Amino acid sequence: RPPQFTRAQWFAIQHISLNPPRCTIAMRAINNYRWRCKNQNTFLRTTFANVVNVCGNQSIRCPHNRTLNNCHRSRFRVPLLHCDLINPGAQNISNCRYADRPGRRFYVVACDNRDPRDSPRYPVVPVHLDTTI
């Protein structure tokens, strides 16, 4: 969540991308938010709206929070991307390689209160991606 992108709008930036390029570069503009590299990421080929609408569906128990239900699983199967840090122990966004694996399924995103200056229409927005099922 850089000083240019919010916590949500920035989440979909790396967690969402209609046309997910080479995980190698696709992890550039994103990682640019921090100095370290990510251990995993999933870019769902869909618009933020299609994601925010999922936060209004029957919530369920999230994997990252076995004691909380602040997330919601996608109702309709959509084409998403699943990448992983193929460089275990490497902390260089310059030489940080990422794996690529296409797939069409749901997605577990943690929705939370957003700022009225970024998402006026949508009340809640995704800030984390557990996985894609």
From Swiss-Prot:
One of its GO terms (molecular function) is RNA nuclease activity. It is found in: Secreted. Keywords: Antibiotic, Antimicrobial, Disulfide bond, Endonuclease, Glycoprotein, Hydrolase, Nitration, Nuclease, Secreted, Signal. Interacts with bacterial lipopolysaccharide (LPS) and lipoteichoic acid (LTA). In vitro interacts with and insert into lipid bilayers composed of dioleoyl phosphatidylcholine and dioleoyl phosphatidylglycerol. In vitro, tends to form amyloid-like aggregates at pH 3, but not at pH 5, nor 7. The record marks Y33 as: May be involved in LPS-binding. The chain holds residues 28 to 160 of 160 of the full protein. Glycans are attached at N57, N65, N92. The keyword Disulfide bond applies. This is Eosinophil cationic protein. Its main location: secreted. Residues 1-45 are annotated as: Required for nearly all of the bactericidal activity. GO terms for cellular component: azurophil granule lumen; extracellular region; extracellular space. Substrate binds at K38, N39, Q40, N41, T42. GO terms for biological process: antibacterial humoral response; antimicrobial humoral immune response mediated by antimicrobial peptide; chemotaxis; defense response to Gram-negative bacterium; defense response to Gram-positive bacterium; induction of bacterial agglutination; innate immune response; innate immune response in mucosa. The modification 3'-nitrotyrosine is found at Y33. Disulfide bonds join C23-C83, C37-C96, C55-C111, C62-C71.
